[model samples]
Target: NSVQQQLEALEKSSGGRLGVALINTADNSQILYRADERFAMCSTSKVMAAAAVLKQSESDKHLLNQRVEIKKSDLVNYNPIAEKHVNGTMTLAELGAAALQYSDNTAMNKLIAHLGGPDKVTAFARSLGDETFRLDRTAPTLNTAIPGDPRDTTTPLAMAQTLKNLTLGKALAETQRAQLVTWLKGNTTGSASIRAGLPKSWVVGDKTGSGDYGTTNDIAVIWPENHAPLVLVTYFTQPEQKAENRNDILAAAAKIVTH
Candidate 1:
């Protein structure tokens, strides 16, 4: 079976909302499945916020070193990253690392605040020619009705394109992109998703997110031996979906990409 067929079969058999955008960096060739459909970004929104910070820091290098005190209220529940430093001061670099690498809700909140607001983050995506993505909310907290809502949503193509821009130095400078990629490589989440699906020789810088209502998301810059990097963005919206099922879908998608 072909790579596209494999992904289509997996999505069909699972019977849920699925969106994917796989792009080859060398030639910009793309394979898309529901790439325009919206899905809750969850913590995956951090990538945009990361780009915003990097873009802004280009003018004021001091932003990266600026520190803010994180109080008791700054810590949000279910944040594994901020939970480690409940009440302390953290630089923007640390906050960015915690937000992207560890998916820390509190760190995201801080970054959003630093960048002005959620609207600014959304604006950043828009600046990159992405009109389908939204940054309307925060994370690590859930509203029973929010998962299906379109707030803070992004299509697979929006994310995939953003990664392409980042890799091409269109969204950030080489130094900024390098740092962002490094932090992403240290990502502590989504072990069973794309990371697991990858071959032993492949290395990836990726992000993962989950919602209260079974929203699983992953966006990665994949490096296969002797091949230009590829950007793979996948999202699944199956309320009450099993975690294993999401991982399996991602693994299957990875298999197709590496085929």
Candidate 2:
């Protein structure tokens, strides 16, 4: 209940909508900090999509530097925002990093295709030991969400657990985990959000995703901190509803716990 007080204050001061969820990957204890909310998860949705690829790679000895050519037609499921970078031949590492670090939509769709298809990914997610998790095949943030388009949706609980599995190398093999971690280390969303409040030089493989409709979100598992058990997921929505408001939800989160 102590965290509730802080959340109430944040909502009041933020003067906007907010939602968040946090749980220890080790103990599964509740560390939620705000509303039980879900949003059109931005590129972060590809985290699971990539997991599907990594799963196959594990079974098929997928190497870290595999070459994959992306043609124009394969990009049907990706967001147009990232379509600008087509025709650039890249390796599997680049595809994975683009999806996670640069949040590239086309790269994500490519990985999605490499893993098999969006339907197969959804089926795999159902067996992943999570309930509130669902990833869309079509990029919803592009305003391209139509009748047959995929929707980007995420619950903090599900996102956090996904990160949990990544941290423990459950989603992929140990070598693949190392490569994935290296790719994530260059994540470019480390600006004024969930990572801002944390100490500098503290290694955090984080992914920040924001939706078009004032939805802001961040998810990560802090490593080498050894302070809070490792997995933390945070979300903020409607922070842009009011221009006068300068929301720093991460500050509240950083203060609430040691992680």
Candidate 3:
């Protein structure tokens, strides 16, 4: 079967919509599986948020190390890092790491706020040539989404492009890109998704997101064997999608690319 056929089959199995974008860095060759469609980005928008923060830090060198106090009221619900720092303070870089490495909601919200708000993040995303990508809501608010809210949404192509830019130092400075990718590789989320698809020798810098509306997504920079690195972004959405099944889709796609 063709890659398209196989991807369509995988989508049909879950009765959901799937979007995938795989880029071979060797020559920028690409495989876009249902890449035109958009889906809820969930916490994955943190990638954009992180880029914006880093971009700003380039102008205002103090922003990265700037300390921000986290009141107990800052605690939302599922944010582990924020829970730890409640009534205390953490540097902007530390918060970014928590948001990236742990997907901490409170930490993400704080960074967004520090960047001036969701619209600024959206503007930054637009600057990168993404029309469907939006960061109009905070992490807690991102969970309370309706289908096609356009508030925290993305297309596979846009996501893959964003990942490519970040990996290439187009989104931020080279040093910041290194820092971002390092934190991404340290991510504890989506271990069963693309990470499971990759060979033990491969390395992936990834971010993951899920929603109550059966949305599961991941965008990452993938290192396949001795070849140059690649960017892989996958999205799955349905009225009721098994998150594990979405991971299976990603695993299958990764095999198709790496093998």
TM-score, each model? 0.92, 0.79, 0.94
All-Cα superposition RMSD per candidate: 2.1, 4.3, 1.8
Local distance difference test, candidate 3? 0.81
Provide the clashing-pair count of each candidate structure.
Answer: 0, 1, 0
Model 1 deviation from native, Cα RMSD in Å: 2.1
Among residues 3 or more apart in sequence or in different chains, the pairs in candidate 2 whose N, CA or C atoms overlap within 3 Å are 138-150
- Model 2 Cα lDDT, one tens digit per residue, 1-259: 5667777777677655555666655566766654345555566666677666666677666554688776666564434434554565667767777788877777776676676666666766766765556655554333221222236565676777777776564766787677667766678765666667677766777777655445556777666465555666766555333333122575456546543
Positional deviation of residue 242's Cα in model 1 after best superposition, in angstroms: 9.0
- Candidate with maximal lDDT: 3
Model 3 pairs in collision: none
Q: Give the clashing pairs for model 1.
A: none
Q: Give the alpha carbon lDDT tens digit for every residue of 1-259 in model 1.
A: 8767877888888766778899988888998988887788877889888888988888897999998788878877656767677667889999899989888888899899988888999898888888887887766542121445878887898889987787555888788888889988889887888878788668889998876556777899888888898899988767563433366677667767667
Runs of candidate 2 exceeding 4 Å displacement:
25-28, 34-36, 62-64, 71-85, 140-150, 224-228, 239-247
Task: Sort by TM-score, best first.
Answer: 3, 1, 2
